[PDB]
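FAQ

Q: What does a record look like?
A: Structure on top, sequence underneath. For example:
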């Protein structure tokens, strides 16, 4: 399924609890699933940005 974006539960759950568009989170997990590390790393990438 290349014409569909996957989003595992862990990343999905946190994504919904964090308020981030998992789609915006280029998932690289087996089957195009946005991995937890993907959402977490990005979520922090935003907060990491100071200026």
């Amino acid at each position: 399924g290349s014409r569909e974006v996957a989003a595992m539960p862990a990343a999905r759950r946190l994504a919904k609890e964090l308020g981030i568009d998992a789609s915006k989170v280029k998932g690289t997990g087996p089957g195009g699933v946005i991995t937890v590390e993907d959402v977490k790393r990005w979520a922090e990438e935003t907060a990491k940005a100071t200026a």
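Q: Is there anything notable about this one?
A: The domain at 1-51 is CATH 4.10.320.10 (Dihydrolipoamide Transferase).
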